[PDB]
Amino acid sequence: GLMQFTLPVRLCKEIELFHFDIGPFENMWPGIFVYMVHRSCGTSCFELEKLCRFIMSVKKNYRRVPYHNWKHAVTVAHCMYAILQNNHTLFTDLERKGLLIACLCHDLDHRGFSNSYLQKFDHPLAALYSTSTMEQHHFSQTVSILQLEGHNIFSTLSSSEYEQVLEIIRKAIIATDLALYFGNRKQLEEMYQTGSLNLNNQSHRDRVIGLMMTACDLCSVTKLWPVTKLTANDIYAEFWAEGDEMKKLGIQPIPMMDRDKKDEVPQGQLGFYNAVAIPCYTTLTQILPPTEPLLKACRDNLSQWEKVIRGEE
Ligand SMILES: Cn1nc(-c2ccccn2)cc1NC(=O)c1c(C(=O)N2CCC2)cnn1C
Ligand SMILES: [Mg+2]
Ligand SMILES: [Zn+2]
């Protein structure tokens, strides 16, 4: 109870910034997450023994894939932490509990293949969940771990608080399906500009939390250039493996997944920054002004990819 988690001085300061990189020391990531829960939610919101056991079961259920791994889970949780700490008074006690957990669990048991590849392979999960296939699986796996003996971090919540927090986690994890992002942001853009956006309207909060999840999920594009650039390698390592698997099904994959069309990556990043990242952090900055550093960092990395195309690197 009086056992505060503390980080070394450089991490203690840099962890508060949107562009923080959790580092290459795997064995610090759990302490970094507990640190963020303690500052974000309180030392009192989870039994430390249950939290520790939950974290380690969640780690165990991420696979050793190049990108959709335990480092991604904690990276997405830190970006959420930075949004919550810069917007203290806009979120309920339960939202602060639910969302960090939602981010840690959002890619649980990912194999490094898109929903499309599951559908074209005819994977069993594609029959169980016809849309947002992996995202429904990630939520299911989250519930599975919450029901392991001594893993129920929400045990002390009321019956209705418990249903609310699991509802927050479910919607948050579903919204990480990039197919749902486009429509969610257009709606949020209209609502903001017509001045109909109302954070007391639960359906409106749902949409805003969904945008926050897309923002945290895409947060590799908001780091220092060398983090952004080296993360892109891991992202494309999965994409190209999926491209290979598409070829094995007798299907020419999209260029994004074709390791023969490696030359087209710079332009592909421009497309992605312009079609997805920039609009996401733009709309997010309009709704949550203190998140502007994400938009600023994203724009800086766009300019870096523009420099790559111009052969200045
Ligand atoms: C959409 N798209 N298209 C190209 C592209 C197109 C043509 C040629 C080369 N590349 C690249 C991307 N996406 C990303 O690069 C990306 C994602 C992402 O889409 N997902 C889904 C799993 C995470 C996330 N973070 N980042 C940087
Ligand atoms: Mg995902
Ligand atoms: Zn993710």
Could you state, in order of their start, the residue ranges of all structural domains in the chain? Answer: 28-310
Q: Which residues are catalytic?
A: 68
| Contact indicator for 54, 47 with CB cutoff of 8 Å | no
- Ligand 1 atom showing the smallest separation from residue 236 Cα: 15
In short, whether 241's Cβ falls inside 6 Å of ligand 1 is no
97 Cα–ligand 1 center, Å: 30
In short, whether 246's Cβ falls inside 6 Å of ligand 1 is no
Token digits for 247?
A: 């070829």
Given the candidates 1.10.1300.10, 3.40.50.2300, 3.30.1490.20, 3.40.50.300, the CATH classification of the domain at 28-310 is: 1.10.1300.10
- DSSP summary character for residue 61: T
110 Cα–ligand 2 center, Å: 7
Which technique was the structure solved with, according to the deposited record? Answer: X-ray
Pocket test for ligand 1, best of 72, 269, 273, 309 (most atoms within 8 A of CB): 269
Is 244 annotated to bind a ligand? Reply is no
**Which amino acid, residue 99?**
L
Work out the angle between the directed axes of helices 225-248 and 265-272 (0-180°, nearest 10). 110
| Contact indicator for 249, 118 with CB cutoff of 8 Å | no
Token digits for 249?
A: 């099904």
99 Cα–ligand 3 center, Å: 14
109 in the Ramachandran plot: left (φ > 0), alpha (ψ -120 to 50) or beta? left
| Contact indicator for 65, 113 with CB cutoff of 8 Å | no
Residues 6+ apart with CB under 8 A from 84: 40, 91, 96, 99, 100
What is the distance between the alpha carbons of residues 186 and 138, in angstroms, rounded to a whole number? 26
Give the rounded distance of the alpha carbon of 217 from its chain centre.
3
- Ligand 1 atom showing the smallest separation from residue 232 Cα: 27
What is the distance between the alpha carbons of residues 176 and 242, in angstroms, rounded to a whole number? 19
| Contact indicator for 103, 139 with CB cutoff of 8 Å | no
Is 107 annotated to bind a ligand? Reply is yes
Residues 6+ apart with CB under 8 A from 151: 50, 53, 54, 57, 145
Using DSSP, how many helices (H) and how many strands (E) does the chain show?
Answer: 15, 0
Cα–Cα distances in angstroms (integers) from residue 299 to residues 224, 247, 290, 291, in the given order: 12, 35, 16, 13
What is the distance between the alpha carbons of residues 29 and 212, in angstroms, rounded to a whole number? 22
Within 13 Å and on the Cβ side, how many CA atoms surround 207?
22
176 Cα–ligand 2 center, Å: 6
Pocket test for ligand 1, best of 272, 278, 308 (most atoms within 8 A of CB): 272
Counting every residue, how long is the chain? 313
**Which amino acid, residue 4?**
Q
